[PDB]
Amino acid sequence: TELDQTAHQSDRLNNALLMAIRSSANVSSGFIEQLGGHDESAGKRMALSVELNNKSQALVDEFVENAREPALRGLATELQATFAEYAKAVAGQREATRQRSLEQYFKVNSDAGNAMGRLQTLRQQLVTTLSERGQQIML
């Protein structure tokens, strides 16, 4: 049944990164809605961005708990540390939205992109490692 446990680890990964990117999509589009005077819609996107990054970090933390094989743990905790960096930058984008400052938005939008670029590469290496472990069981 360790076979179906590598699939749960892979789905936690894919869901975490998808929601992590959806959260940045919500703050940027919410920032635009705010500049158009759509305060209510912008507030809902801020809340959705909070909820998505919290859900993603919960999956990430569940991911590193169940990653016990050392061929997997080395990439797992770098994914957690990189994500905490990504989460703070998106949180910085949200406070710039509430403050209506393009200045603060550009200040941390480069941080979010850098951490997201490393998150996507870390997912690729982790997905390959999980797929390799699952295949190792069938042979």
- Residue 35 interacts, among ligand SAL, a second copy, none and using kind-specific CB cut-offs from 5 to 8 Å, with a second copy
* Alpha carbon distance 45, 122 (integer Å): 27
The structure tokens listed for 14 are 């894919």
The answer to the question of residue 59 lying near a second copy (CB under 8 A) is no
DSSP 8-state code for residue 100: T
Please, which residue, 9 or 28, has the CB nearer to ligand SAL?
Answer: 28
Please, which residue, 21 or 50, has the CB nearer to a second copy?
Answer: 21
- Residue 105 interacts, among ligand SAL, a second copy, none and using kind-specific CB cut-offs from 5 to 8 Å, with a second copy
* Alpha carbon distance 43, 28 (integer Å): 12
The answer to the question of residue 80 lying near a second copy (CB under 8 A) is no
- For residue 110, the tally of other CB atoms under 10 A from its CB is 10
The structure tokens listed for 100 are 């209506």
* Alpha carbon distance 81, 62 (integer Å): 14
The answer to the question of residue 26 lying near ligand SAL (CB under 6 A) is yes
Please state the closest distance from residue 95 (CB atom) to a second copy, in A: 14
Binding site for ligand SAL (CB under 6 A): 21-22, 24-26, 29, 109, 112-113, 116-117
